[PDB]
Amino acid sequence: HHHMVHITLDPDTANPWLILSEDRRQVRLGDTQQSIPGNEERFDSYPMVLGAQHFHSGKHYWEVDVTGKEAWDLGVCRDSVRRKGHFLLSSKSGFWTIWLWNKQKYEAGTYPQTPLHLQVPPCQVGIFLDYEAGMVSFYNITDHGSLIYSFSECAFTGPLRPFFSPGFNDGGKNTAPLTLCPL
Ligand SMILES: CNC(=O)[C@H](Cc1ccncc1)NC(=O)[C@@H]1C[C@@H](C2CCCCC2)CN1C(=O)C[C@H](N)c1ccccc1OCCOCCO
Residue 39 to residues 14, 43, 76, 86, Cα–Cα distance (Å): 10, 9, 21, 17
Experimental approach:
X-ray
Residues at CB less than 6 angstroms from ligand 1: 46-47, 73, 86-89, 99, 101, 113, 165, 167-168
Q: Residue of the nearest CA to atom 9 in ligand 1?
A: 101
Q: Return the best residue to mutate from 17, 86, 96, 165 for the ligand 1 pocket (most ligand atoms within 8 A of CB).
A: 86
CA–CA distance from 140 to each of 66, 106, 134 (Å)? 11, 12, 21
C-alpha 47 – ligand 1 centre gap (Å): 11
Q: Could you give the CA distance from residue 129 to residue 116 in angstroms, rounded to a whole number?
A: 20
Going from the N-terminus, what domains does the chain have, and what CATH number goes with each?
18-180 (2.60.120.920)
The count of residues in the chain is 183
What atom of ligand 1 comes closest to residue 48's alpha carbon? 23
Q: What is the resolution of this structure in A?
A: 2.3
Closest CA to 154 of 125, 137, 134: 134
Phi, psi of 77 (to 5 degrees): -145, 155
- 46: CA distance to ligand 1 center in Å? 8
Closest residue by Cα to residue 27 from 41, 42, 8 = 8
